[PDB]
Symmetry: C5
Subunit: 208 residues, 5 copies
């Protein structure tokens, strides 16, 4: 009869925060979805935008699974005690500013969810933000050091209201957000690196 103190204790034993949990010989499947919450400073001259969003991130780590028959099925764990994808926004020009406690949710079957609220500035296409069609800023997120055979990233395919959580007090409004996937092979290495491109179509409110 283990409690929550036991679950965390035995997770610290099996978990290796620096060892990607590749099962057999397959890549770790990381799903990523960006819940846009706000759009702050926007500079059409420099093509920069300050965005706030909840980066819903999920994956499975079997080395964490336990028996939930006489124990809770889920627990909150500091991410510093788990392995986490080394995701990076390729066109970000400031490091990600995490606004929420850095805790992930771990399910007895090894499923992991981490959804930090992040504030980050980006280099993207802002032109057209003050027009009916709006501007389309594309955000590219993917593993920085794990190629396609170690980590694959796919947008959590779930038809959701693009502005379900978007602040109603923002000067901007979201016209549409589309998430796509891509595989790129750089110089350094022969293997491909997967990324997800989130396109944020938005414009200023109250235009003539």
């Amino acid at each position: 009869a283990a409690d929550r103190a036991d679950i965390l204790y035995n997770i610290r034993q099996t978990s290796r925060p620096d060892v990607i949990p590749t099962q057999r010989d397959r890549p770790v499947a990381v799903s990523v979805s960006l819940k846009f919450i706000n759009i702050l400073e926007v500079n059409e001259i420099t093509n920069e935008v300050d965005v706030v969003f909840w980066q819903q991130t999920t994956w499975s780590d079997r080395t964490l699974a336990w028996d939930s028959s006489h124990s809770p099925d889920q627990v909150s764990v500091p991410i510093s005690s788990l392995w986490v994808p080394d995701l990076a926004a390729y066109n970000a020009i400031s490091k990600p500013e995490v606004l929420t406690p850095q805790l992930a949710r771990v399910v007895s079957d090894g499923e992991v969810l981490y959804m930090p609220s992040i504030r980050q500035r980006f280099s993207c296409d802002v032109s057209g933000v003050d027009t009916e069609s709006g501007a389309t800023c594309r955000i590219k997120i993917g593993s920085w050091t794990h190629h396609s055979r170690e980590i694959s990233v796919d947008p959590t395919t779930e038809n959701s209201d693009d502005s379900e959580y978007f602040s109603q007090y923002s000067r901007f409004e979201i016209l549409d957000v589309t998430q796509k996937k891509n595989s790129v092979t750089y110089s350094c290495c022969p293997e491909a690196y997967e990324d997800v491109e989130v396109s944020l179509n938005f414009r200023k409110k109250g235009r003539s």
Copy 2:
């Protein structure tokens, strides 16, 4: 009997900072209460405010309980030695800047009080701030990863002077502050997350 050294030593032995102190199978009852100290910046156009407040937070942790029979009934302890509610302001657009020493007060009975002074920026309704009826900025604070069955949040209905500790030198003045309990559900999970909605009715000071 014992001294402050023993109390902290003991807290050190039984305290589990990363384990939510749920006694039995019910949620930890956390009380939240904001005391507004200042309103530094307000933007009528972007609907943004920069404020300073004391986030009075209390909860119970049985494991820390000790007999004050012949020793102090209270000690100041670094929050890094205790478990703390993973509270977050859902509409905040900046990381919380804790202006005070990160020490919590622990009562011999396991009661915990943590009151950090915090400066933080929020996205909220600033319209009407320049009028007699002022503006109403609602700030939502609740656990980030613990749903209703693990954490409950309720305000401290201590009907006091909303501007009791408010700075007299601020450019704004407080008209009224009300704290309402609120529940919310999201995608990830079926169970809802509780939060305390703080309505700050304030306006600019002056004639006209």
Copy 3:
């Protein structure tokens, strides 16, 4: 004899940085005095000031005492190795920017001295800063979690020249500084908290 290394080793053995060193069952007498070095960014419209000052702090911790008959009677020690009063400036709107090496000076009898040069911004009365009588900004500094029975704060009775170390290059000049003691009771607790009130009377320099 004994060397500075021995002194530091033993200090580290007896020092309980997280335990207030109360003698008998009395409060630790903490002396606080400010030496103003500069006045940087004044704003009479927002009633905010950016100030640089030396926070001369002294207290006693007998549990760090040693025999200096054949050894040195003083050593510099990192503050992390010592218990330090959890002092806070009640009307500060930015956390303190400690500009100096965080080392405290310890005497063999247990007297501790810690004097960091601090740059911090405050919310205070800036009205009249550009008039002959200048403005009077009052700074309140005291323990954040230790009430009167645990910590007592008193302004060092000394009387250095108010602007003896104040930069001659500031746009402003000090007209007078008075540091008075004070006590305050809150909503959380029946026992009061002590604080020193420092009144900085200053003005922008004239011309001719």
Copy 4:
């Protein structure tokens, strides 16, 4: 027949982060290559630029080698666990801001690859940035404390688009980039510190 866990373990076990991994008695051969991603802010009056670039850095540490016949021959490793070249931009006027996860890639032969995306400000010739011939900002990168006998610096001679990864939304465009091997010496001593001079020839984009 060892998995990634054993590999990383071994690496954390034999790696000496503070000891230069000198093979026999020849300097450590470090290769440095900059891949400009953006030119954020430019000032022709103060000869100062703000640029983002991927700093491709490679070297060898034979002690980390492991038999990958029946095991992975490449793992991601926290640079904190490894010895890393103490490279510095000699004409940088700001601390390098690493925007990406600080992980290096280690091959089973001891080859170490580290490519952090960095944002940093430099003091360099910006004159002509607004002409068809644009400006030429030269950035010097080399070891800060290891002269030529301890560390050698060489540009990863690899033909490729000078702006293959440069932002298309930037306000500037890259005309050419030449990375030349070179060295620096100081009065005091005969010691010679090798570096890589990266010539960034760019100009303001024409709105046409």
Copy 5:
């Protein structure tokens, strides 16, 4: 013979980062020399300047000495493994932004050198910066907690051009640098603290 790893281990096993390396009861003789690299933000209205310099620091700890007849004569060591002078710029109004890897150089005879490149804002006489005679900004640096009998600082009146490494791209030029020494007693203690005062004579570069 001994390799670099053996040299480090010996250093780590005898150097005491928190213990000043005093000889008998003689004060540690520290050498300070500033090599200006740039003069960035300059404000004659507020008398503030942003300066980038190499803070060449020298001292010795003979207990770290080894035989280099058949072993390296020098090694780079993280300053966190060494005792380092607690130097502070008295008229600095910003904490130092260390731009270079924080590694020192220890020589086999016990000498230790540390040359961090630093950017710091100073409060000093900026008046006359736009004239032929320019301005004279005096920078004062010395130990913060070690008086004259524990540490003595001396300006290396070595032969070297003032703007030998000074940037050509700065909006200013150096006219003459002179280093003097001083000793001061403060309202806290009886013993005096030494310091080196650097007078930087610079002016706005003009086509005259």
